[PDB]
Design a protein around this ligand. Structure first.
Ligand SMILES: [Cl-]
Lengths: 16, 84
C-alpha cells in the first residue's frame, strides 16, 4: 500500500 | 555498493532507510528521472526485507515502481483537478 504523500528521498549526492 | 543484512543491523531505522535509499535511488532514477526522489521515498516506506529483495530482483523493483508511478500520477492529477 503505497503513499504518494511520502517524503522525497534525498541522496548524499551532488545536485546540479 | 552491495548491501547486506549485517550492514542494516543495529543501525537506526532512519539510517537503514537512507542505506536502502542510496542503493535504490540510482535504479529508480534511471527508470523515471523526473520522479526519482518521490518514487524512492514512496518505496522506502515498504518493509526492509522486501526492499532488500527488490535490490536483488529487477522485475520486482520494476513492478513496484510501476505501481508507485500510477499511484503518484493519480494522486497529483486528482488533487490538481479538485482545485482547478
Ligand atoms: Cl520520468
Amino acid at each position: 500500500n503505497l503513499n504518494p504523500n511520502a517524503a522525497e528521498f534525498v541522496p548524499g549526492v551532488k545536485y546540479g | 555498493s552491495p548491501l547486506t543484512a549485517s550492514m542494516l543491523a543495529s543501525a537506526p531505522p532512519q539510517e537503514q532507510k537512507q542505506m536502502l535509499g542510496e542503493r535504490l535511488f540510482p535504479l529508480i532514477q534511471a527508470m523515471h528521472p523526473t520522479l526519482a526522489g518521490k518514487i524512492t521515498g514512496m518505496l522506502l516506506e515498504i518493509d526492509n526485507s522486501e526492499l532488500l529483495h527488490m535490490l536483488e530482483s529487477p522485475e520486482s523493483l520494476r513492478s513496484k515502481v510501476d505501481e508507485a508511478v500510477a499511484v503518484l500520477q493519480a494522486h497529483q492529477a486528482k488533487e490538481a483537478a479538485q482545485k482547478a
